[PDB]
Structure 1
Amino acid sequence: ANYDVLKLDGTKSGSIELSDAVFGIEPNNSVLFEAINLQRASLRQGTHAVKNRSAVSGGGRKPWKQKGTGRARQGTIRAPQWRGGGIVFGPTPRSYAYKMPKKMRRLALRSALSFKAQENGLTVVDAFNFEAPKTKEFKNVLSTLEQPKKVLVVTENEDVNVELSARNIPGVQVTTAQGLNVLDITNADSLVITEAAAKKVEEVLG
């Protein structure tokens, strides 16, 4: 419910009230698993194909007469049992993405955020004061905030200087309030969120 609000130097600037309905619920592991699986499946490019017996080059004619040669009967040199033949079934291009009810999506987002709020993996900063992109200064800020390797940085909107400062540090990822997703949140060990971003997240996830 009540959360400390820190400066970039670690000083405890103030306090914020975060809706228990967003950061305070008991995570639904079933729905969270379904959402992670769904997002991972949506990331798939199903560009995989093989040539079946119709698609293989040539192979129109009968290799030899049906009877009298003493050999097994055959119909085309591109049959699947032939070396160089067509493939039986095999991959064919298709999308792996599927949908889930919107209420389930929201429950998944709330479950991930509440798991972060539990286990003391959430921290709120007062603001980000990056006027120019400086990776070393952002790394210093993270070190002062005493954060683990994997951090998800959440801003209210697209903050270009914060994004440019952070995008080269391994394990650090930056998103906006609207960009929050289960894969990103669960992969991170800690969330560093601005006060305005946290307020917006509460406003939209209710």
Structure 2
Amino acid sequence: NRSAVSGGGRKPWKQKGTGRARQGTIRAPQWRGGGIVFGPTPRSYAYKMPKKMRRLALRSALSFKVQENGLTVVDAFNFEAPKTKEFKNVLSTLEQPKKVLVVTENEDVNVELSARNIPGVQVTTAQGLNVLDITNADSLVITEAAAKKVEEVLG
């Protein structure tokens, strides 16, 4: 702004005594290379929301999927080591869309490892769900046991 620009402390010329317009500094808004009037400033954009409204918006996303036949419960995962191709073949047997959200009871490195590279596939945990991932995912795949845990948390 006016004060942050470099130089421009003296007055270019006196007030009267010529046919020039009166000025007070060479770094004013109407001068080339000096001064910004109202520009961006470093600020935040986050805000809060009541707790009850948070839980309701989440239950609305889970119900929206079941209304489209987009929720499938599986047995478990027995991935001994991380193999991406084996995980891709699993998604072909279930006949899932191109984007899939996988839920788990707790962190499982192999299940997340063998799936993070596939495009359009996202993997998270039961307690780490949000409205952005549920809405983005075309289908929802959740474990049998993990499904019951997400139930008691939402109440």
Compute the TM-score of the two structures, normalised by the length of structure 1. Answer: 0.73
CA deviation after TM superposition for structure 1 residue 141, in Å = 0.6
1:144 is the counterpart of 2:93 = yes
CA deviation after TM superposition for structure 1 residue 128, in Å = 1.3
CA deviation after TM superposition for structure 1 residue 69, in Å = 2.5
CA deviation after TM superposition for structure 1 residue 194, in Å = 0.4
CA distance in 2, matches of 1:196, 1:60: 72
Look up the SS of the partner of 2:122 in the other structure: strand
List alignment gaps of at least 5 residues for structure 2: none
Look up the SS of the partner of 2:79 in the other structure: coil
| Mean Cα deviation higher: 63-72 or 81-90 | 63-72
Moved over 3 A (4+): none
CA deviation profile, 1:107-160 (whole Å, cap 9, x unmatched): 111111111111111111111111211111111111111111111111111111
Look up the SS of the partner of 1:119 in the other structure: coil
Percentage of matched positions with identical amino acids: 99
- Name the structure, 1 or 2, with higher relative contact order (CA <8 Å, separation 6+): 1
CA distance in 1, matches of 2:86, 2:125: 20
Look up the SS of the partner of 1:129 in the other structure: coil
| Mean Cα deviation higher: 99-108 or 53-62 | 53-62
Which of 153, 167, 178 is residue 102 of structure 2 equivalent to?
A: 153
CA distance in 1, matches of 2:12, 2:146: 71
Look up the SS of the partner of 1:60 in the other structure: coil
CA distance in 2, matches of 1:183, 1:118: 18
CA deviation profile, 1:24-73 (whole Å, cap 9, x unmatched): xxxxxxxxxxxxxxxxxxxxxxxxxxxx1111111111122122221221
Look up the SS of the partner of 2:68 in the other structure: helix
Compute the TM-score of the two structures, normalised by the length of structure 2. Answer: 0.96
Structure of greater Rg: 2
CA distance in 1, matches of 2:17, 2:68: 79
CA deviation after TM superposition for structure 1 residue 168, in Å = 0.4
- What is the Cα-based RMSD across aligned positions, in Å? 1.0
CA distance in 2, matches of 1:66, 1:201: 75
CA distance in 2, matches of 1:96, 1:153: 30
CA distance in 2, matches of 1:125, 1:74: 76
CA distance in 1, matches of 2:21, 2:144: 77
CA distance in 1, matches of 2:20, 2:73: 78
What is the aligned partner in structure 1 of residue 72 from structure 2?
123
Q: How many residues align?
A: 155
Look up the SS of the partner of 1:120 in the other structure: coil
CA distance in 1, matches of 2:116, 2:127: 18
